[PDB]
Symmetry: C3
Subunit: 254 residues, 3 copies
Amino acid sequence: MVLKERQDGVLVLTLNRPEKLNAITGELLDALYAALKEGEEDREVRALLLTGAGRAFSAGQDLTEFGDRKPDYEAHLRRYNRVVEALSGLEKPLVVAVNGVAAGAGMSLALWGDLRLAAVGASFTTAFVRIGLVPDSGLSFLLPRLVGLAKAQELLLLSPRLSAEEALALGLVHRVVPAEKLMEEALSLAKELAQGPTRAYALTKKLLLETYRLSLTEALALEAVLQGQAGQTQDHEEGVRAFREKRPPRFQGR
Amino acid sequence: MVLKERQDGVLVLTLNRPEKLNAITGELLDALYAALKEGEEDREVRALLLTGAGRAFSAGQDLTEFGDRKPDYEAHLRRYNRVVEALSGLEKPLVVAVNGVAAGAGMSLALWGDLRLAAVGASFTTAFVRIGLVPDSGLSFLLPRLVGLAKAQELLLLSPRLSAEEALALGLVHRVVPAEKLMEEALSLAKELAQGPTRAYALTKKLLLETYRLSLTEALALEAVLQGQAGQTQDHEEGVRAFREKRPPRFQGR
Amino acid sequence: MVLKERQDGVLVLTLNRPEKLNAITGELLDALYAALKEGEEDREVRALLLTGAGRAFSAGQDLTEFGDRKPDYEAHLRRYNRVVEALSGLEKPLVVAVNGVAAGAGMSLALWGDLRLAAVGASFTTAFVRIGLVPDSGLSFLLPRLVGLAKAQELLLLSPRLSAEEALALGLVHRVVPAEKLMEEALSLAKELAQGPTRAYALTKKLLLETYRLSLTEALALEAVLQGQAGQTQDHEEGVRAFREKRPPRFQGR
């Protein structure tokens, strides 16, 4: 369901239902959740890389999973939301490599990467509105923050099929590279992050995730609390030492 | 005060005080609110289109009555903010066609459109600061979200006169078209929306309005609740049926 | 520590530790805080201009004291966050002139300007992550609001050195000017602002600072309250009169 591979501190997760364009099912989500939990808890893992097998990243919800049964969407989203909670709370950087179609919840999941890359030919389609649904799996939370409300309105209400270049223009991805180079570039970035100050990355992500709903006073207090934690890490000491010694730091994520 | 026209499920509202550049008055606002309430309640109205008659969309608050008594802007806004509430809460898509000058409260009203088009030659000026006032009618809420804090600061504090092309770059509008084609383009878009899944549009708008103030967990919960609702609509059933039957869907807005 | 000089309603504050690239210390913060309070409380000061003496605006926190004792960043930040509270709360416009390197907390401080100008050659580096720290001094609050979450993620996690031109494209600054003409242009803008409706500027800033955490209803209510206040100022009366009389207004900040 989800392939797992480790390389130099990087846990590579590959959605694996290629014949179905990695369409999402409860089984896939449970496997993805288990993989994220393992990655989050494995001290050897300093970074994660998420991508899709085959021609697409993920076409979103597999409509065949419903069959002829009646919609029970509020409950059905339980598996999606726990995966989103896990992604949002990762205490390690996540790189996402969008290799092809990313639509619906597939797009929602792709956008949770801290650093995102798309291959030439990849596309982003909100898609939900096309079948009379609303954005889910955190897309209504992430999209406005990532591309601004003006573009979020257009993307969600009109559901255009965005090219990789258009995604780069809006901030949906940070880089666009030739299809045959996507994974090498993404993995190279993930390995660099895997050598970085993991706790700083983790705590920085927490600040960003909670910043919009906080007053400046509350934000300053949170920065104080989290900086206090970061300041006590062995990595911070190493960081200061390396700077003074005019040498590269050797971080260990603690 | 406000002209009301109907066409293929689209309620077209035109601010009608061209001789005064559609200056905003309490009379105009009550008329707009009445029309919005009517459109919102009319099940046959699947979309709305708002534009201005004459040379401008709206030059903002009419200052004629100033000096007549002690300026009570708090009382005035508390009384008319219901118009903004109504605009933002429309359970159907709103298209705005900016035919010319949009300033002050005129700019505020124009920015409430879900999809916004501007005619070549149209302009956007925050204007409030020029007469010692702060942005109102939702502008302080919408501007930062639509164009980002950096640009909002500049536009509000310096109040430059933005061209239609500049507005497009900032995200104030989604499209710029020849003045003689503005209404044709806007109505075409509105009619397309009036054939779409109105409930999905409505609920998606609800999610966007709350996106920044909710925690991720609260957002995921609201998404699940609204998807549960959307999933029960006739439109969703049709959307899935049409997809499986490789044919176009025939949405009814329920 | 901090140079102070008044000029035509403008209080010019210059970080003064050029030999140390204006590296931030508690002593420097205490001086800046005192200067900010003075400008805030001085009714004759209607605009402030912040810049750095020497080749750099500020390279951020001075790491000289590190090692002397157990790192206590929460205590330190809780003690000096009052400086950021003061900056953000100024009831008058603040212009920032970034003359060179702005990194770490130096970047945090520069971004608090309402209108920001950078000299050709100036740069912006988040820097915190390079020594295993999280963004502080309000940077985690300001950055995503100013440039959006997508860009903020990239700037904070990878900490690239941003040129003045790239900072301009993103919105980190509103204008770029020759290094030799920076202060001239910055001071000119500040003096212009010092002639503007100070109360309108003050209340507008308040709305912007609090906008993201508020529901639309709360935002509309706050706009009503603050507009009521602005509407009572003599500057508003002058504003309306000047508009009717088709003449430039003569604001006094009251």
